[PDB]
């Protein structure tokens, strides 16, 4: 029967939308993202609440009084934090800070526009009810790299699990230290390094807790074939009007499953627990990682 079902879906596989006849009042698309009222790890500091129909910069919004908040950890100026006077810095091009290259270019088609009054960049993706840097160390675009290491979900017999006529994926997920929500491994790009090193380094630090000889070589084989699936704006709750997270997503897919099987998952650094988790559309993950998983299943023609 399994073969009959498999042959049947391999052989059976003006655009008009008639859903208005069923619902009656369509409430558009997914609208626009609004971050939560309480800023994480801030000690009860509350943002300026705004409706989702008011976030975009095309809309006027004269009633706007955001709160300026910067975290004490960021205000202590660590090596990875930009100076408090964000003038003297060129955005939208590759900029050299202490002789080390940092990206600073946003994936928004319009680009980043610079405010005249304080020299602080303004977020194009839309308001968030909060100015200043907050928990983010760099003014403007904080480039994050996410590592989606995937394998096909297989039952013991060796057959790949199939749901809704598509093959089922499986990805490595970590439990975050700060908010205890499951997420894709990844992190902010360090100075003088690129997305390749950052993606790989964060995946070893978080999901493998490293820092294995031929096994190490096996892991290298896994990371020899990676595809940049998306470069999007994160729906991260720490985002403000002057500092926002944008992610480049790198997918490492293991077609045979040999290289994926050599990974001894054990949470380290900013991860509590790490495990293999099935990819589907009902996942409750941190920030906009569901969109990233949608992009990896879209690229691999997998279930979602």
């Amino acid at each position: 029967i399994s073969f009959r079902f498999s042959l049947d879906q391999q052989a059976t596989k003006n655009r008009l939308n008639s859903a208005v006849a069923v619902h009656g009042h369509t409430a558009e698309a997914a609208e626009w993202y609004v971050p939560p009222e309480e800023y994480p790890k801030s000690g009860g500091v509350k943002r300026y609440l705004i409706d989702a129909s008011m976030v975009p910069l095309s809309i006027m919004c004269p009633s706007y009084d955001p709160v300026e908040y910067t975290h004490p950890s960021v205000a202590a100026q660590p090596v990875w934090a930009d100076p408090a006077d964000p003038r003297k810095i060129k955005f939208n091009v590759k900029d050299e800070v202490n002789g080390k290259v940092v990206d600073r270019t946003s994936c928004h088609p319009s680009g980043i526009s610079i405010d005249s009054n304080t020299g602080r960049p303004i977020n194009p993706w839309g308001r968030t009810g909060m100015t200043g840097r907050g928990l983010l160390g760099k003014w403007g675009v904080n480039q994050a790299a996410d590592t989606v290491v995937t394998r096909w979900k297989r039952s013991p017999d060796g057959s790949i699990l199939e749901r809704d006529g598509k093959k089922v994926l499986e990805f490595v997920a970590i439990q975050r230290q700060d908010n205890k929500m499951w997420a894709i491994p990844g992190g902010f790009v360090d100075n003088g390094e690129d997305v390749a090193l950052t993606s790989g380094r964060e995946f070893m630090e978080e999901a493998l807790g490293m820092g294995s000889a031929e096994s190490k070589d096996s892991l290298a084989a896994l990371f020899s074939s990676g595809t940049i699936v998306a470069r999007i704006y994160c729906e991260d709750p720490r985002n403000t009007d002057n500092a926002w997270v944008e992610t480049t997503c790198v997918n490492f897919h293991d077609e045979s499953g040999r290289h994926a099987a050599r990974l001894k998952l054990q949470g380290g650094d900013d991860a509590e627990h790490a495990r293999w988790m099935m990819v589907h559309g009902g996942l409750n993950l941190f920030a906009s990682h569901r969109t990233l998983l949608q992009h990896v299943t879209s690229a691999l023609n997998a279930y979602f």
Binding site: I1, S2, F5, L161, E162, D164, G165, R275, G282
Partner: protein, 384 residues
């Protein structure tokens, strides 16, 4: 009915230690006068309750939610050591029965099949059965099962521990008011108590009342119950098996905590609601068969919405997320379908859950010896 003045609590590393006074031990247990209180006050509500038409008396201890479950495990060990002597029969199995309280309206044929299977399993393995402390539904059914156990097995009777939330018992205040030890306190289910309405089941042998200071708000013992069972499982090096029959939102939370604490679960498919949802979720996430290829997240969400009526999309999302989190690890869930199987396949499912554990090899082989399944023992020995 002479009151105990000294008790034997077992040491943390040896066999058993020195006998010391009851109040000294009972200082490790707290009570909340109100919900707001966190540090608490000494509990003083511990002793034995006498129920009508029951010859033996049942111990009860009210402790707080933040209290250590290891202390409660010592309490159970100390009572058994006092009553049956130092060399009492150690458990090789902890069988946890959870599920529907007030919404347990199950067809008789299934009820007889579940009752028969549970009676066959518990009798044969001298299991410690841990259920809720209430006289409602499946717990009452389990109580009826253990009632037949109480009229046999010679001297030693395996405890039927009932863990109930203090604040739901029509006689809770009587148990607390008084001097710290109470030996013959009578339990009145028919008494008309104003705030609460749920009475304690008369067939349970020991009682653990989890207190958080709230009134008429169930759901406060799930974590303790899972943590106790896990603590009991580690101490006697015996596997813990949870059984999910029918169910409601707290049964889902019970299964979530159980799978989070490493305890395996046995979901009886076809037995009701939180069981059909759990069975559907596992089969969707893990089963490679052909009839489960049409399973979707949308149909699972539709089933959760029709069965637990969450009201808020966020509540539905949280229930769905919790249900999917329960069936994350395929080893810890074993699904027995009621309408598609046999009388001895339920014992095979219980045995599969027992072997599904990590390191308790001697006890798992003992369970295999009790159920008369040499092959499970062999295959396991050959694999080891």
């Amino acid at each position: 009915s002479v009151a105990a003045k000294t008790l034997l609590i077992e040491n943390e590393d040896g066999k058993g230690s020195t006998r010391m006074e009851v109040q000294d031990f009972m200082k490790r247990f707290h009570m909340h006068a109100s919900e707001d209180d966190k540090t608490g006050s000494p509990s003083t509500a511990w002793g034995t309750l006498r129920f009508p038409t029951k010859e033996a008396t049942a111990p009860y201890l009210r402790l707080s939610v933040n209290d250590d479950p290891e202390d409660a495990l010592l309490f159970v060990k100390a009572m058994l050591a006092q009553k049956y002597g130092e060399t009492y029969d150690r458990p090789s199995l902890i069988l946890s029965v959870t599920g529907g309280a007030r919404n347990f309206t199950l067809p008789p044929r299934l009820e007889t099949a579940i009752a028969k299977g549970l009676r066959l399993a518990a009798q044969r393995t001298n299991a410690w059965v841990v259920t809720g402390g209430t006289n409602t539904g499946v717990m009452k059914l389990t109580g009826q099962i253990m009632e037949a156990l109480s009229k046999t097995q010679s001297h030693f009777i395996p405890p039927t521990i009932g863990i109930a939330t203090y604040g739901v018992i029509i006689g809770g205040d009587d148990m607390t008011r008084g001097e710290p030890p109470k030996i013959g306190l009578e339990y009145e289910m028919h008494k008309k108590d104003p705030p609460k309405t749920t009475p304690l089941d008369d067939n349970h042998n020991l009682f653990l009342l989890v207190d958080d200071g709230s009134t008429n708000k169930f759901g406060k013992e799930i974590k303790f119950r899972a943590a106790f069972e896990n603590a009991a499982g580690q101490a006697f090096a015996a596997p813990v098996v949870t059984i999910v029959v029918q169910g409601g939102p707290g049964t889902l939370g019970t299964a979530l905590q159980a799978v989070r604490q490493g305890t395996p679960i046995v979901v009886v498919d076809g037995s009701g609601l939180a069981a059909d949802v759990l069975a559907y979720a596992y089969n969707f996430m893990h089963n490679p068969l052909t009839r489960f290829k049409s399973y979707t997240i949308d149909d699972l969400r539709q089933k959760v919405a029709q069965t637990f009526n969450p009201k808020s999309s966020q509540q539905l999302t949280n229930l769905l997320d919790s249900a999917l989190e329960c069936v994350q690890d395929p080893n810890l869930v074993v699904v027995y379908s009621l309408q598609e199987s046999g009388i001895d396949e339920f014992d095979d499912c219980i045995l599969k859950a027992i072997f599904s554990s990590q390191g308790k090899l001697g006890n798992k082989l003992k369970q295999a010896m009790y159920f008369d399944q040499l092959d499970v023992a062999k295959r396991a020995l050959s694999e080891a």
